[PDB]
Design a protein around this ligand. Structure first.
Ligand SMILES: CCCCCCCCCCCCCCCCCC(=O)OC[C@H](COP(=O)([O-])OCC(O)COP(=O)([O-])OC[C@@H](COC(=O)CCCCCCCCCCCCCCCCC)OC(=O)CCCCCCCCCCCCCCCCC)OC(=O)CCCCCCCCCCCCCCCCC
Ligand SMILES: CCCCCCCCCCCCCCCCCC(=O)OC[C@H](COP(=O)([O-])OCC(O)COP(=O)([O-])OC[C@@H](COC(=O)CCCCCCCCCCCCCCCCC)OC(=O)CCCCCCCCCCCCCCCCC)OC(=O)CCCCCCCCCCCCCCCCC
Ligand SMILES: CCCCCCCCCCCCCCCCC[C@@H](O)O[C@H](CO[C@H](O)CCCCCCCCCCCCCCC)COP(=O)(O)OCC[N+](C)(C)C
Ligand SMILES: CCCCCCCCCCCCCCCCC[C@@H](O)O[C@H](CO[C@H](O)CCCCCCCCCCCCCCC)COP(=O)(O)OCC[N+](C)(C)C
Ligand SMILES: CCCCCCCCCCCC(=O)SCCNC(=O)CCNC(=O)[C@H](O)C(C)(C)COP(=O)(O)O
Lengths: 56, 88, 69, 178, 459, 104
């Protein structure tokens, strides 16, 4: 019976999906501005024995 | 509480009381349907004085246009009852 | 005697007021209870010096548990 | 407040109104009752001294003089009845007056209380709905061709008629509504 | 900040794919969710701004404005669905589309990192507003109102475009961070004076500055209720935001080019407050109120102090909320009696008590009763002006007295007295209207509880 | 015809209370209207208002007010004990500044 329910209320996933897609795209945009990661005079730091990057 | 629920009988009693305290009107010859000009032989000034006496008795003023018209104690009682929303 | 008193309809304003109270309380009583429980059973952090060789996390720089979360 | 006004006042009407105003302001000046009675009798004698003037021109001149004297000698703070248009309780209870049509919008739960009152209300509404057209037609008949000339309304004359334009006079809120 | 932009662009097809009888419900729910998401932007820093990307950034000045925009969308939706009931489904969807596009343009305007992109969005906000006014207004004056709204704006904004491209050819960048860090003083020459005027007049006409405000009463009276809400609450604040942004490159020339605008603002504040005392239309009174408050905001921006900037930010937010609430309150009576004349329907407190309470609270916030954020902004601006010159208190003092007078005049004329006898179609207040008023007023006092969230970057 | 055009008459306004004495003013359909009321109230008062106010109240101190207070306490303690002035008129060391050679 869920056919009619889905065809009547499938417009309710567009906005949450847009929200998660916007979060993903913001992470992707942040991924392109790491030219100074762990390189500022104020926050330059020696790495921990296990970690690879100071922030993502 | 507040003042009692004024009734038509009380209004008529007070009107007749005031009219019988008037020196120019004989008590027994006065009736509830007595006319001021015809039956009692009063002029306009006496009617004005009677209207002012009614105002003093009930504690409220009556407009001149309305006051001029009343001619018998029945009209005075009816006007007072209609003004104060008296039905019993 | 007892007379009828003419008034405008007070049903709809009262209904709106009780609906607003109901929804606000519905979501705000759990929040108040949770805040009280957190404050009683998970207190605030105590200021301490950074131990040698330790690099604290960014949220470890605040004192209130809800703010830290 | 209840009677329809006329196009103008007459000379005797003006004299009576001035007499009442002068008596009231004199009472305002003469606080005590015996002094007021003394000076009110003096005022009445003064008023009825010139009562028998057959020259209307001199009568109006005397009225003009008396009005000027009254305006010069009036009380700046005369006594006003509390519910008169300048009194301390003039429009005090106007905020408690609610028109009767507001009852038409009560929720049915509100109308569940007071069933008999609303039955009587329905009877009154049916009466008005039945009498409206007869009232309108009676007004149509009794009105002169060149429109009405006064604000006086005719009464009911026929078998079970009602005086035209009665609903909002009969169904006044009250003088002490709440 | 695509996590806010993308959900609105998704509001668009969600509206255009909804069933004919669920458009309002869906739009309202998802607008409220988007507002909740935008609430996260209030977590600001103390030194610099949040630099999301090369294109978008969030400051402590634009975050409350974005929150106000996203919160205003659902309120407009609730306010519009009453008088649009007889409209066809396609036209209702087009109305919602106009509102969504306006929100998207406003959201992108407040976060653009470059001045040309900011210009393009701040000018794109014109088309939905003009369409809304000229298509869904009630009277025939709406066409003239749309023309006045369009041309007053464009005649100010085009010289700004010329000045912006000139500045980019001169300094090599229009990015706001570069502009701020590489700032250089302006000399005293006719070229620099005209550059100042070109950079300032568009924002002046947006406020609008006294003498350049004639478009505002027309546009704000002839518009539908949602149009009036968004015109008074958000679109006037574009001028203030842009002026605080652009004044970074105008020093030290402002030190004396501000005099005519300061005199105009103070005197026209007095004049518009006085105009509010004799107004037969209830909506025009609220419009002229907006003009007076915005004149105060102009003064604060022109004197260029930290306290004046804090006061300007607080006053802009407070005025947006208060003026939107007042417009909705007037629209309720208009929908009841189909007339805007203020003395037609009287004694409404007898017939609608809760709506009278809403009227009282709205008019109390209009006159800046403490400790409302209205008064916080007004008092900060007054203190800054007093430091600027001790004689401003007289003009400022007169304005406070006049504002109280006309606010309470509106309240007493509409709510007190005796109800007009002939009007018998005043139905009880709907739940929707009461919820609208509550959602306007509760955030005001909640913000009073924590005023550093609306005090700007100078805090 | 003594007319100018064929037009529908202006219709009377509909009262939502007539067909629905508890109408909530959202829609003519009682079920849709009731659910519109419910979603407005739940997502405006319960979700955005109260929860958003709590979230804003408990936001972490990124404005660095308490950090600045503690730093100032350290600085005042150090400067008071040493006999140094609490604050200096110049915020930049003059040794790193090179004034122009000639003032004449
Ligand atoms: C009805 C609606 C109608 C419409 C209206 C509009 C509504 C709009 C609402 C919109 C949404 C708003 C939401 C706001 C979110 C803000 C929440 C928040 O931040 O909380 C802040 C704050 C919590 O602070 P915190 O930072 O979280 O805690 C820090 C510490 O770690 C904590 O320290 P601690 O370790 O000591 O722990 C203390 C702990 C435990 O404390 C104790 O247990 C000790 C108390 C003393 C008891 C000692 C004696 C008693 C017992 C003795 C006997 C028993 C023992 C012995 C047994 C034998 C008996 C002999 O208590 C608590 O945890 C705090 C209480 C929780 C309150 C949270 C508020 C959330 C509200 C969200 C809901 C909004 C809707 C409202 C609905 C809510 C329900 C009605 O909550 C308060 O408000 C505290 C106020 C109380 C202070 C005293 C008042 C001082 C008066 C001064 C002024 C005088 C002038 C007169 C004016 C008086 C007016 C009051
Ligand atoms: C100050 C007292 C503190 C009390 C502690 C608790 C307070 C909780 C209140 C929560 C917020 C109020 C909600 C606002 C919407 C009104 C609700 C409504 O629609 O009525 C239906 C509701 C149902 O009854 P009903 O039979 O259907 O009556 C409906 C009829 O229309 C007939 O209705 P009515 O004739 O009863 O009138 C309704 C009422 C309600 O209408 C209103 O105007 C209330 C809204 C306040 C004015 C808003 C603009 C002014 C700007 C001030 C901003 C202050 C807000 C602070 C932050 C609050 C956060 C929510 O209006 C009034 O009675 C007089 C209003 C004039 C107020 C003058 C006070 C000026 C400021 C004084 C100090 C404020 C700061 C405190 C701290 C200072 C330093 C220690 O009515 C009531 O239950 C009575 C309302 C309660 C009166 C509150 C007035 C004082 C509260 C001021 C703000 C709260 C301060 C809390 C901090 C603790 C201190
Ligand atoms: C209705 C509301 C509209 C909005 C209001 C807009 C406000 C615009 C006003 C512009 C403010 C100032 C503009 C120019 C700055 C100084 C003005 C001038 O009068 O001052 C003297 C200028 O001297 C003389 O006045 C020369 C100008 C005379 C010609 C100007 C025409 C003014 C007539 C009024 C026309 C109305 C203009 C607005 C149209 C609506 C200063 O002496 P000087 O040191 O030498 O010039 C300084 C520039 N230097 C350093 C490069 C040399
Ligand atoms: C109908 C009947 C009404 C009367 C009956 C009511 C009964 C009583 C209820 C009234 C409550 C009284 C208020 C008294 C104040 C107590 C609450 C106060 O203590 O909380 C404040 C907190 O308040 C919040 O910070 C302010 C709320 C935020 C307002 C944002 C609105 C939500 C968004 C909605 C849309 C936005 C539109 C506007 C755009 C800008 C304290 O701030 P803060 O000093 O830090 O706390 C220190 C401890 N911390 C930091 C660990 C938390
Ligand atoms: C406190 C200070 C205020 C006091 C100042 C006031 C001083 C005023 C005193 C002097 C003024 C007069 O008397 S001026 C007297 C004017 N004379 C006339 O008008 C002659 C014709 N008579 C009539 O018109 C009617 O008979 C009429 C007499 C009206 C009676 O009416 P009734 O018999 O059909 O009821």
């Amino acid at each position: 019976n869920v056919l009619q329910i889905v065809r009547d209320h499938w417009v309710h996933i567009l906005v949450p999906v847009g929200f998660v897609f916007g979060c993903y795209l913001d992470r992707r945009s942040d991924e392109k501005l790491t030219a100074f990661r762990n390189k500022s005079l104020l926050f330059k730091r020696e790495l921990r024995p296990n970690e690879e990057v100071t922030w993502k | 509480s507040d003042a009692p629920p004024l009734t038509l009988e009380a209004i008529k009693d007070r009107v007749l009381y005031v009219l019988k305290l008037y020196d120019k009107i004989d008590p027994e010859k006065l009736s509830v349907n007595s006319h001021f000009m015809k039956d009692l032989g009063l002029d306009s000034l006496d009617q004005v004085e009677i209207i002012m006496a009614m105002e003093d008795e009930f504690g409220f003023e009556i407009p001149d246009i309305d006051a001029e018209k009343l001619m018998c104690p029945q009209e005075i009682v009816d006007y007072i009852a209609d003004k104060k929303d008296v039905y019993e | 005697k007892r007379l009828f008193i003419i008034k405008p309809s007070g049903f709809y304003d009262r209904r709106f007021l009780k609906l607003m109270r109901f929804y606000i309380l519905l979501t705000g009583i759990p929040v108040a209870i949770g805040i009280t429980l957190v404050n009683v059973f998970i207190g605030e952090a105590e200021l301490a010096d950074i131990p040698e060789g330790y690099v604290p996390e960014h949220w470890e720089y605040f004192k209130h548990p809800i703010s830290r979360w | 407040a209840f009677s329809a006004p006329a196009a103008y006042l007459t000379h005797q009407q003006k004299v009576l109104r001035l007499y009442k105003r002068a008596l009231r302001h004199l009472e305002s000046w003469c606080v005590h009752r015996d002094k007021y009675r003394y000076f009110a009798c003096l005022m009445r004698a003064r008023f009825d001294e010139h009562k028998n003037e057959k020259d209307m021109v001199k009568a109006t001149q005397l009225l003009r003089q008396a009005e000027e004297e009254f305006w010069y000698g009036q009380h700046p703070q005369p006594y006003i009845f509390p519910e008169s248009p300048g009194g301390t309780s003039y429009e005090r209870y106007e905020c408690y007056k609610v028109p009767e049509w507001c009852l038409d919008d009560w929720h049915p739960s509100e109308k569940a209380m007071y069933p008999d009152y609303f039955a009587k209300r329905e009877q009154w509404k049916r009466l008005r709905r039945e009498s409206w057209e007869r009232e309108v037609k009676q007004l149509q008949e009794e009105t002169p061709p060149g429109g009405p000339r006064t604000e006086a309304l005719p009464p009911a004359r026929k078998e079970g008629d009602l005086p035209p334009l009665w609903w909002h006079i009969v169904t006044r809120p009250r003088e002490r509504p709440m | 900040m695509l996590k806010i932009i993308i959900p609105t662009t998704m509001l668009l097809p969600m509206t255009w794919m909804s069933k004919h009888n669920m458009i309002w419900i869906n739009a309202t729910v998802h607008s409220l969710l988007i507002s909740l998401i935008s609430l996260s932007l209030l977590n600001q820093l103390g030194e610099n701004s949040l630099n999301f990307s090369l294109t978008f950034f969030s400051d402590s000045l634009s975050a409350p404005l974005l929150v106000l925009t996203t919160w205003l969308l659902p309120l407009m939706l609730m306010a519009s669905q009453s008088h649009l009931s007889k409209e066809t489904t396609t036209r209702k969807k087009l109305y919602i589309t106009m509102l969504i596009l306006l929100q998207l343009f406003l959201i992108m305007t407040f976060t653009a990192t470059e001045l040309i992109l900011f210009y393009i969005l701040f000018e794109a906000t014109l088309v939905p507003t003009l369409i809304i006014i000229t298509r869904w207004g009630n009277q025939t004056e709406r066409l003239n109102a749309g023309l006045y709204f369009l041309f007053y704006t464009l005649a100010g904004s085009l010289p700004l475009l010329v000045a912006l491209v000139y500045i980019q050819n001169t300094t090599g960048s229009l990015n706001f961070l570069i502009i701020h860090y590489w700032s250089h003083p302006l000399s005293n020459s006719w070229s620099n004076i005209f550059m100042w005027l070109a950079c300032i007049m568009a924002f002046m006409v947006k406020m609008p500055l006294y003498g350049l405000h004639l478009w505002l009463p027309k546009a704000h009276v002839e518009a539908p209720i949602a149009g009036s809400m968004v015109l008074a609450a958000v679109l006037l604040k574009l001028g203030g935001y842009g002026m605080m942004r652009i004044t970074t490159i105008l020093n030290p020339l402002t030190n004396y080019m501000a005099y005519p605008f300061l005199m105009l603002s103070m005197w026209g504040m007095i004049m518009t407050s006085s105009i509010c005392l004799r107004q037969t239309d209830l909506k025009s009174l609220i419009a002229y109120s907006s003009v007076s408050h915005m004149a105060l905001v102009i003064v604060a921006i022109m004197i260029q102090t930290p306290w004046s900037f804090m006061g300007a930010t607080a006053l802009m937010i407070a005025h947006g909320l208060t003026s939107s609430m007042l417009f909705c309150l007037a629209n309720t009576n208009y929908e009841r009696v189909h007339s805007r004349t203020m003395i037609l329907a009287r004694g409404l407190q007898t017939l609608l008590p809760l709506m009278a309470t809403w009227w009282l609270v709205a008019s109390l916030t209009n006159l800046a009763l403490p400790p409302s954020i209205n008064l916080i902004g007004e008092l900060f601006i007054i203190t800054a002006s007093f430091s600027w010159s001790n004689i401003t208190i007289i003009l400022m003092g007169m304005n406070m007295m006049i504002t109280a007078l006309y606010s309470l005049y509106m309240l007493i004329t509409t709510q007190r007295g005796k109800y007009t006898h002939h009007i018998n179609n005043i139905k009880p207040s709907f739940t929707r209207e009461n919820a609208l008023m509550a959602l306007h007023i509760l955030p005001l006092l909640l913000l009073t509880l924590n005023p550093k969230m609306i005090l700007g970057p100078l805090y | 015809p003594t007319i100018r055009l064929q037009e529908d008459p202006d219709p009377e306004d509909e009262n939502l209370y007539e067909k629905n004495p508890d109408s909530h003013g959202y829609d003519k359909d009682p079920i849709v209207d009731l659910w519109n009321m419910r979603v407005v109230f739940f997502f405006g008062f319960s979700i955005v208002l109260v929860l958003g106010s709590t979230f804003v109240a408990y936001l972490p101190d990124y404005r660095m007010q308490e950090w600045a207070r503690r730093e100032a306490e350290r600085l005042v303690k150090y400067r008071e004990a040493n006999g140094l002035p609490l604050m200096e008129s110049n915020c930049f060391d003059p040794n790193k500044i090179q004034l122009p050679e000639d003032e004449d």
